[PDB]
Write an enzyme that holds these catalytic residues in place. Structure first.
Site, PDB file in Angstrom:
ATOM      1  N   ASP A  35       0.834  -1.201   0.000  1.00 48.78           N
ATOM      2  CA  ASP A  35       0.000   0.000   0.000  1.00 48.78           C
ATOM      3  C   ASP A  35       0.872   1.254   0.000  1.00 48.78           C
ATOM      4  OD1 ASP A  35      -1.918   1.919   0.304  1.00 48.78           O
ATOM      5  OD2 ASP A  35      -2.384   1.392   2.420  1.00 48.78           O
ATOM      6  N   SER A 199      -0.540  15.460 -12.205  1.00 51.17           N
ATOM      7  CA  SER A 199      -0.770  15.087 -13.588  1.00 51.17           C
ATOM      8  C   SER A 199      -1.024  16.336 -14.424  1.00 51.17           C
ATOM      9  CB  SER A 199      -1.980  14.149 -13.669  1.00 51.17           C
ATOM     10  OG  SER A 199      -2.369  13.883 -14.999  1.00 51.17           O
TER      11      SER A 199
END
Length: 330
Positions: A35, A199
């Site tokens: 994770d 992004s």
């Protein structure tokens, strides 16, 4: 040193991925959820409330000659999906894919929430976010990667998750045969303890690319892709019959649909998520309404590039002095 381990979907939907991890002496192999959005290595154990164990493999520290109770240490964690767990702490030898750390904090669960009990395939979590998020008190502990880093050939790990198929976590090296083209690296902020990046935009299907900054986290522990409501609305508007259902808890779509791809930007590079990666199947057994793999982050407070996005790429978690992330197509 290096390590290399195969990671395997837990079910036919890729709801999560499990990776075998050796703990203790002799080794006890547990299948952990790696994770990159949390920083605790915790396991079901011989100390877990018996009614909260339902098929998991447990760590028994009394059977490990290298286990040592970390005196006075406890831990307690809550995750973004509302699940939680807590307990006490041992140090022990932990190996992943041939890479060994001695003295790793292994957090033994005394209590787990129902979602953990109900998932017999996940024996615990191995956190790979920054150690500043580790919950052990009163002395915070380091992640497996943080402990291993200085010994690694290069201070990196890579995630190569498969679509409905096994994949690989590598430590200490970049497998240049595992991707196509080049790896595009992008800046990371560690200020919230996550692999947080920006992004450069998105496209839906064959549509034009929209240049827009989307700050979010690379999170292997989260199944879906959570993005701003504007972006998610633009995606689902391209699917006939799709709608946001408050009763179901997100966007659903007719199971008969053909889903468009979704592209996200990494600098000037582009990662294309095929449409079928966005299909999470019937909302309930036998339903013709299917659950979408792109969902709104409104209310979460952060955008999450979870498995839906990451499995479309070869992803480098670069833990150099100034961390960065790398993405390649594959």
């Amino acid at each position: 040193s290096t390590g290399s381990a195969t990671t395997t979907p837990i079910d036919s939907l890729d709801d999560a991925y499990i990776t075998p991890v050796q703990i203790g002496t002799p080794a006890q192999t547990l299948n952990l959820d790696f994770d990159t959005g949390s920083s605790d290595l915790w396991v079901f154990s011989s100390e877990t409330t018996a009614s909260e164990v339902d098929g998991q493999t447990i760590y028994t520290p009394s059977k490990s000659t290298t286990a040592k109770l970390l005196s006075g240490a406890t831990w307690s964690i809550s995750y973004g999906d509302g699940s939680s767990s807590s307990g006490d702490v041992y140090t022990d030898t932990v190996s992943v894919g041939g890479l060994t750390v001695t003295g790793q904090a292994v957090e033994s669960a005394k209590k787990v929430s129902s979602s953990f009990t109900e998932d017999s395939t996940i024996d615990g979590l191995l956190g790979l976010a920054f150690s500043t998020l580790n919950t052990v008190s009163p002395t915070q502990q380091k992640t497996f990667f943080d402990n291993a880093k200085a010994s690694l050939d290069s201070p990196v790990f890579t995630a190569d998750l498969g679509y409905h198929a096994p994949g690989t976590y590598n430590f200490g090296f970049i497998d240049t045969t595992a991707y196509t083209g080049s790896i595009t690296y992008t800046a990371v902020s560690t200020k919230q303890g996550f692999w947080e990046w920006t992004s450069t935009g998105y496209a839906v299907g064959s549509g034009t690319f929209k240049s827009t900054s989307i700050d979010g986290i690379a999170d292997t522990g989260t199944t879906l892709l959570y993005l701003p409501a504007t972006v998610v609305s633009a995606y689902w508007a391209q699917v006939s019959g799709a709608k946001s259902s408050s009763s179901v808890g997100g966007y659903v779509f007719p199971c008969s649909a053909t889903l468009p791809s979704f592209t996200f930007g990494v600098g000037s590079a582009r990662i294309v998520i095929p449409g079928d990666y966005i299909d999470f199947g019937p909302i309930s057994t036998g339903s013709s309404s299917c659950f979408g793999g792109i969902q709104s982050s409104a209310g979460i407070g952060i955008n999450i590039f979870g498995d839906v996005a990451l499995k479309a790429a070869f992803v480098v978690f670069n833990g150099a002095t100034t961390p960065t992330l790398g993405f390649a197509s594959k």
